[PDB]
Amino acid sequence: MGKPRGLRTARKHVNHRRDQRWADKDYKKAHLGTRWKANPFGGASHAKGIVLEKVGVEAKQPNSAIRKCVRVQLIKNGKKITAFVPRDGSLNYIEENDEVLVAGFGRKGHAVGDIPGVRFKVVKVANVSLLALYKEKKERPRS
Amino acid sequence: GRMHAPGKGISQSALPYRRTVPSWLKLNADDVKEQIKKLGKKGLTPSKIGIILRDSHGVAQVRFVNGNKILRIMKSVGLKPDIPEDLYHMIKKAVAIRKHLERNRKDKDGKFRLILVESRIHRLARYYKTKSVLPPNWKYESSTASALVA
Amino acid sequence: VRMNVLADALKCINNAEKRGKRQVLLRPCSKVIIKFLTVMMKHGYIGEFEIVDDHRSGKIVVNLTGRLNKCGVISPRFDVPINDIEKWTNNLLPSRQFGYVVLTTSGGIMDHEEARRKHLGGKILGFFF
RNA sequence: AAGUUGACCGAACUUGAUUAUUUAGAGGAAGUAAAAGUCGUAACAAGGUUUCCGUAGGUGAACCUGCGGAAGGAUCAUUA
RNA sequence: UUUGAUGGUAGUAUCUAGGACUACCAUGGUUGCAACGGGUAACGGGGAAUCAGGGUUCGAUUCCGGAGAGGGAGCCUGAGAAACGGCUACCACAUCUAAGGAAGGCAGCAGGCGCGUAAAUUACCCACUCCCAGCUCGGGGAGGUAGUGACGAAAAAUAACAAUACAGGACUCAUAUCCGAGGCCCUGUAAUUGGAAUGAGUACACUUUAAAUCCUUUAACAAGGACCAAUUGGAGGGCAAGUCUGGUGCCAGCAGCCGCGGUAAUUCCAGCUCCAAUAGCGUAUAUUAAAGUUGUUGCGGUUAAAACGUUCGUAGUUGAACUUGUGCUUCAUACGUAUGUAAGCGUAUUACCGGCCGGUACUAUUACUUUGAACAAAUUAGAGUGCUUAAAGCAGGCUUCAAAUGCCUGAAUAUUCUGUGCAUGGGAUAAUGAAAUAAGACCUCUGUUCUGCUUUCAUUGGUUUUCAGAUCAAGAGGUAAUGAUUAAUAGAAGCAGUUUGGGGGCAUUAGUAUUACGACGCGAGAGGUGAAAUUCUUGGACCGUCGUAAGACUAACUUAAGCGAAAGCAUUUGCCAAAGAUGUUUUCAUUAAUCAAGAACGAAAGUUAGAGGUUCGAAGGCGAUCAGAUACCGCCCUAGUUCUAACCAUAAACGAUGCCAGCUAGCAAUUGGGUGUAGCUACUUUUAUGGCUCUCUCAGUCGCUUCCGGGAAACCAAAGCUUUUUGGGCUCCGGGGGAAGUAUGGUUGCAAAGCUGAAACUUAAAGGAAUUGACGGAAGGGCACCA
């Protein structure tokens, strides 16, 4: 539908797809500079930080469980975010103000499931690799 | 059809396949020379000479009785117009819409019909300045125009 | 207005054979389009057509068999060299058994089997199978 | 050789303007989540005043009313 | 563009051109084909990642090029540097100092701090490849070489062969969804046990190398699982895999999404098992494919997101047909047939000599296309080849176990460096070009006019003619078929044209009505409503009647009619200008198509400034109803409706459907025009006309019926011809839902507001057409003493 089918319309065609790529939500997400201004991660996969408080997120209904998140301030630009910790245990293994390594959750930035707003996930705490201390292959130091 | 109107109706002349008929003509074929210009001296545009000779002579089509057309025969005599005919009548219309509008304003649908006829004087001017029967520096200015056509 | 005579006389063929008429009237027969049907005539698809000669532009009353399936035109007439002549037979024609893409090469109007042996390139003029 | 006179390249700081970002703010006002609060029932059934639109005014709130439009209507309509 | 911007001119300056710099003149130069400005998480290119193609993303990174050494500037020597492993200063950081002063730049190789999600040894030698010096020999953290190294690629430990033990189906056969014997062409579980192999290690020596290490080569050692002991994820679906057992009880938690979990959990946590890939695999971010969800190939826009309200209109994009096409004669050539190479007629497809053949004079153009030229390698494509194979590598192989300058051949060809530019063939397609009262061609070759200069006037000078290499114009009156394609079921314009239409403007004019008043009769009611009340009767109302006056609105006729670009348009009559259509052996000759920007019009409401001011009537004020009622209903009313002169620019401005063009079907009506109906038919007499009748015909518009149609359907002669990802051209718009047509900037406006127009955050659905139930101020047709 539409498009000019003449011989010398290469000017209009490359103008149009440049004009109309700015309606696509996936193109324009990566072409606006907000992987540093809006992303509290520094345009990257992981980040490190220092925690503040261990809190209970009320899950979105139909499901109903307090979700045991952690609100952390990452040291890269001082922004204060909230991360989720998996695999029950996981908060008697934290002992607040230990240095944590934080990653994403999986849906390419935005939130995922029953937990509203929480987009990041704790990977290591005090260097000892939280998924491995959950199965007690590593122990968090008492120092 | 109709660049400035919706109505797509088709109607024209249907010229036949045979060319040199009349096979019954009273005089010379080229004695329409001295009746193209003898009625060209009465100020008749060649549309009116193409139909005044359909009924007295009565010639069918001039470009088969002679070699070439009616407008070319007149400037072979030397009666070509100062402005060609499809601009002479297209401007005399746009003159008359302005003279109707210098007394009957509140009329936004005679005004619209002026923008139509002025947007196509500018299309026959933009062509006649290419094929070089109008010179350049020839525009439609509507303050001199009424002394051209009258 | 008619920016192609070749489109306004090949859809006019193709619309009149899906209804299965035996004669199509096309208008107004550019000599481009006569030598397009002459490619289609000598491969069986078209009967011996007749050119009515009125001295305005011409008319043709083209006989046909019923072997045609889709006989359209490509526009705009893309210049095709010989090395990219098979990118236009692959994605267009149904199989490489049969069908043709007609070219206006530098020598004449010919299909894509005679041009690849005579080693000529040109513009795409249309297609039929 | 020092030193010098005049030109020319010109760092640099001081001031003004010009951009291009980022940030503190009394108050104000919109949005989202949060169903489980209050008040009424706006809409969908002729949702009990058919609805919607543009535009103005009015009203605790959904809304109301005028003027014009549309059917996405509750009439494809039978009335020489 | 003052303060060089664009050019001229003379200069200076430099190695040299040049506004590079100066002085004087000139006013240029770039621009919607995107200049200028901004951003860049930008060093450019070779190349890299990923796909069937078309492609998207990346390239700090070993190769070429640019660039720079904390920040800027300056500069010396030098053929070469605006050099920083050179200097000078300023700025910022640091250093030593006996306080006077002196020196410093690791974005060289190592190493330390720091920042960080994010990156190794303060090792060894110039044997290699080359570079430099006075130069066989010196130097070179260039370079090679070990140590770290799960970035990434390649080849592959974690068993194998049998025995009985217990065991399966199957093979023969008693027998046949029962059953024995040879249990067996079977495989498992066996700390039964007993055997065969072995590299993993290990260790002499060796080869290795600059000296080494490792691998390869290796004399001695080295397997019985209890060990030389493979783990990472998952077992609801998507997705190959326990409806296993205990635990917990919408808890703990799990889950990419859908979904699980509420004292039986196939989804949690564990046990017992199982399934995938395997020295691997899981997670996070990015990116490609998936994606026909960015659509050139290849989407969508009636209703799902989406045709600008309307039409003009420049840039742009697209543009009707037409020109030497072939025929014969042939022969060369697949089998009387087939020319597919060519030759002979359409008056001359370029003039000479050479022995059909070469030098040779002469080439309307561009795009396209053929084959070329031309140019880095690595990569890539990939030829060849037993590094044992492999990814690689550019070697190697042979006679041959040899003696043996003793041989043999390597070390391809291409995409790429896609395009530009050049050479050559072609001349289909597509533009431009030419000859108009001829500054047309050859000719009238006339000498009327030429231009010029090297050969000879012994040498050298004067008188001056010819060939004049060439170049202007010919004695012009004569010899050239002496030159203008069609006229588009394209457009435009005309017409002695006949009309036609609620088209627009201005006057004029009519119709009843609704008021409001004036008379007169009447007598107590009247408005209204679900019921009311407000309200009108100082009775003279209501009603009846004649009236006068004013402002509105143009009924009925009124249609599935018409006109108009759209919004819109209805009393006659006059005048004004314009329009479609039909007719036309009229005229011109491609003038056309569509369209950013820009223009003109744009219902209602709202706004200004006057004139009006009946009806109606937001707002306001009362009366009811109602739990409430700022509403619906009822009364007087205000802004407004009205007219003028401006503004505004939006409507469900809808057919939720852009415009020009071609095609594709029935059936019936009507608007307009044309043409044959002595078809009728009004009467001057029939005729001329008018009315209709059927019969045609244009442009249609309606209507209905179904396609060889299409679509998710509803449905539509277009919304079809969107074949088998298709192609007539042009333009606009959409990319899940919200936040939001918000914020903000700009622009328009007197204001109201209009045209532009995001993101944060949030979300697993929102939506379309249809189906069954629900069976309600939904109509229809029926039933019952639980009516």
Numbering used by the authors:
A (entry chain AX): 1 to 143
B (entry chain AN): 2 to 151
C (entry chain AW): 2 to 130
Q: What text appears in the publication on this structure?
A:
Protein synthesis is essential across the tree of life and undertaken by the highly conserved macromolecular complex of ‘the ribosome’. mRNA translation is regulated at many levels, but until recently the ribosome itself was not thought to be part of this control system. Here, we have characterised ribosomal protein heterogeneity across 4 tissues of Drosophila melanogaster. We find that testes and ovaries contain the most heterogeneous ribosome populations, which occurs through a combination of paralog-enrichment and paralog-switching. We have solved the cryo-EM structures of three different ribosome complexes purified from complex in vivo tissues; 80S ribosomes from the testis (3.5 Å), 80S ribosomes from the ovary (3.0 Å) and polysomal ribosomes from the testis (4.9 Å), improving the resolution from the only other previous ribosome from D. melanogaster.
We performed a similar experiment with ovary 80S ribosome preparations, collecting a dataset containing ∼200 000 particles, and resulting in an average 3.0 Å resolution (Supplementary S10D–F). Comparison of the testis and ovary 80S models revealed that the main difference between them is at the P- and E-sites. While the ovary 80S average did not contain any densities in this region, the testis 80S average contained densities that did not correspond to a tRNA (circle). The IFRD1 density was not present in the ovary 80S structure, suggesting far fewer ribosomes are inactive by this mechanism in the ovary. Specifically, the three switched paralogs (RpL22-like and RpL37b in testis 80S; and RpS5b in ovary 80S) showed the largest differences in their atomic models out of all paralogs. Whereas in ovary and head there is >16 times more RpS19a than there is RpS19b. This analysis confirmed paralog switching for RpS5b in ovary, i.e. there is ∼2–8-fold more RpS5b in ovary 80S ribosomes than RpS5a. The importance of the paralog-switching event between RpS5a and RpS5b has recently been functionally characterised in the Drosophila ovary. Females without RpS5b produce ovaries with developmental and fertility defects, whilst those without RpS5a have no defects. RpS5b specifically binds to mRNAs encoding proteins with functions enriched for mitochondrial and metabolic GO terms in the ovary, suggesting ovary RpS5b containing ribosomes translate this specific pool of mRNAs.
